[PDB]
Amino acid sequence: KVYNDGYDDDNYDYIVKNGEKWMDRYEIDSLIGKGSFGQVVKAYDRVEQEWVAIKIIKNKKAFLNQAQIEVRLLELMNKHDTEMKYYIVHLKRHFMFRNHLCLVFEMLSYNLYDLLRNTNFRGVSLNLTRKFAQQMCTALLFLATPELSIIHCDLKPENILLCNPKRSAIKIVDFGSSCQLGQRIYQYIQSRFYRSPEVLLGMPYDLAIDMWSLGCILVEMHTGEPLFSGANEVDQMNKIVEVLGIPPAHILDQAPKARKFFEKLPDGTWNLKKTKDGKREYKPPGTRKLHNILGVETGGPGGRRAGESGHTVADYLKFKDLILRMLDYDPKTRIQPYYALQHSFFKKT
Ligand SMILES: COc1ccc2c3ccnc(Cl)c3n(CC#N)c2c1
Numbered sequence: 001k002v003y004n005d006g007y008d009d010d011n012y013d014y015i016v017k018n019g020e021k022w023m024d025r026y027e028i029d030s031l032i033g034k035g036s037f038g039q040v041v042k043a044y045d046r047v048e049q050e051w052v053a054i055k056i057i058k059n060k061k062a063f064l065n066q067a068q069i070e071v072r073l074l075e076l077m078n079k080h081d082t083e084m085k086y087y088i089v090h091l092k093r094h095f096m097f098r099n100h101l102c103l104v105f106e107m108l109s110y111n112l113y114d115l116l117r118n119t120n121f122r123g124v125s126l127n128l129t130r131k132f133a134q135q136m137c138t139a140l141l142f143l144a145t146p147e148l149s150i151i152h153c154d155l156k157p158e159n160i161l162l163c164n165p166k167r168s169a170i171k172i173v174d175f176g177s178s179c180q181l182g183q184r185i186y187q188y189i190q191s192r193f194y195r196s197p198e199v200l201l202g203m204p205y206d207l208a209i210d211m212w213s214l215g216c217i218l219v220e221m222h223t224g225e226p227l228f229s230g231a232n233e234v235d236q237m238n239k240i241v242e243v244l245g246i247p248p249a250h251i252l253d254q255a256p257k258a259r260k261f262f263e264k265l266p267d268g269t270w271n272l273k274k275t276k277d278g279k280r281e282y283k284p285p286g287t288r289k290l291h292n293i294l295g296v297e298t299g300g301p302g303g304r305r306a307g308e309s310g311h312t313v314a315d316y317l318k319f320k321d322l323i324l325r326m327l328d329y330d331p332k333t334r335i336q337p338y339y340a341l342q343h344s345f346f347k348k349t
Pocket residue numbers: 032033034035040053055089105106107108109110161173174175
């Protein structure tokens with residue numbers, strides 16, 4: 001049963017072969033990544049004399065047409081940003097090869113999941129978490145500039161890569177899920193752990209959904225574990241409710257899928273759906289305090305940062321305050337990137 005003349009496999013992916021030369025130019029070293037979109041390979045560019053990364057989009061229409069948007073958007077961002085400046089991966093060129101759209105990128109280093117893993121999920125320091133937060137907020141400031149108005153739509157540790165193994169410099173990758181403020185084209189989006197209330201609730205969204213993600217990410221970066229590790233949409237919403245409480249009546253009143261997670265009393269207040277059989281699985285609303293998760297006054301997450309430098313209680317109080325502003329239920333009031341950069345948490349040395 002041949003797929004695309006035997007170049008693809010049963011899942012519309014190109015069968016990678018180490019040492020293959022493409023178009024008398026690119027030498028394929030190895031497979032280095034995978035995802036919904038397809039594959040990413042490490043390759044040497046004879047012409048330019050450099051190592052690159054080539055993202056090999058799946059050979060199917062729906063997946064192609066989506067990478068076409070990733071290209072349009074990267075080209076548009078690299079056009080403003082021609083100093084490789086603003087914390088966004090660089091699209092060198094692209095081409096069609098054996099019926100696969102291939103995108104050639106600069107070669108980058110570890111993503112932030114690999115980096116968490118490397119500490120055996122103990123978390124990185126608060127100092128380092130600050131650096132990622134400063135850059136990510138700046139990248140998100142960039143994305144918001146009115147010419148662009150770009151929603152990334154799938155922020156997560158795995159889509160933030162270091163430039164260099166032993167350095168804090170980072171770039172955001174994978175704009176395959178991405179869109180612009182007007183041209184909104186989907187319902188079920190963002191990775192689940194990093195999905196915003198408004199998306200869960202089936203409401204319309206804007207750029208603020210990335211900020212939500214960013215909040216989930218920064219906590220995870222310092223503690224080692226996802227702030228809201230939900231196994232599906234109902235679990236996920238419930239894990240958020242543990243920490244932050246019930247979402248304001250004015251939001252739920254507008255949410256088409258409010259009733260998937262909640263129910264409205266006779267008196268007009270909302271509450272979690274009534275459950276069953278003397279079962280209890282979650283902590284009551286608002287009870288899982290972020291104050292304890294970060295371990296503000298107990299030596300950091302898990303007491304593992306006890307009596308270290310640059311982890312004072314004050315550092316944590318700032319860091320906490322920022323994060324609660326990033327996780328505001330209301331997207332009209334969730335801190336925006338301009339203002340986040342001015343937050344106390346960055347006041348200098
Ligand atoms: C390790 O170097 C790179 C460089 C660019 C990319 C890159 C660019 C656009 N989209 C994705 Cl998903 C990208 N990955 C994912 C992986 N693995 C990259 C990895």
